[PDB]
Amino acid sequence: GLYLQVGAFANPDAAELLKAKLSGVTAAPVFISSVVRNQQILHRVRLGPIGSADEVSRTQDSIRVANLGQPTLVRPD
Ligand SMILES: CC(=O)N[C@H]1[C@H](O[C@H]2[C@H](O[C@H](C)C(=O)O)[C@@H](NC(C)=O)[C@@H]3OC[C@H]2O3)O[C@H](CO)[C@@H](O[C@@H]2O[C@H](CO)[C@@H](O[C@@H]3O[C@H](CO)[C@@H](O)[C@H](O)[C@H]3NC(C)=O)[C@H](O[C@H](C)C(=O)O)[C@H]2NC(C)=O)[C@@H]1O
């Protein structure tokens, strides 16, 4: 399973909004993974698991077309 991260936010509404928008441009599960980092809560907007490298590439393209951020491969935490 391959995962992308599209943004990471201190504001939870910003993370939830990005999650909602991403659900309109991919069929992969979109979720928020929140962690403590640098004494703050960081809400990381991720999607996956994606079943193939080619689908990752096309999903990255769709996210860029939608102007939603810079979709980056991540290892799930
Ligand atoms: C793809 C991704 O997740 N990018 C985020 C980025 O990630 C790093 C990361 O490096 C490692 C993990 C590390 O830092 O240890 C790595 N990516 C991954 C996935 O691992 C890669 O190398 C560098 C970079 O990419 O982290 C930064 C924080 O350091 C995230 O930055 C956030 O960017 C968003 C989008 O620009 C900010 O939101 C915007 O804020 C402006 C005002 O500043 C508003 O006017 C905009 O409306 C708002 N956009 C949206 C869509 O809401 C975001 O700041 C806001 C204020 C927030 O935190 O709520 C900013 N977050 C932080 C914590 O700085 C980047 O998303």
Resolution as reported, in Å: 1.4
For residue 35, give both structure tokens: 């962690």
Residue entry with tokens 């943004």: 7
Distance CA 61, CA 13 (A): 25
Buried/exposed code over 13-42 (b: 16+ C-beta within 10 A; e: otherwise): eebeebbebbeeebebebeebeeeeeeeee
| Ligand 1 and 3: CB distance under 6 A | no
- Number of residues that this document lists for the chain: 77
- Report the nearest-CA residue for atom 20 of ligand 1: 74
Method: X-ray
| Ligand 1 and 22: CB distance under 6 A | no
Distance CA 59, CA 77 (A): 20
Residue entry with tokens 């999607």: 47
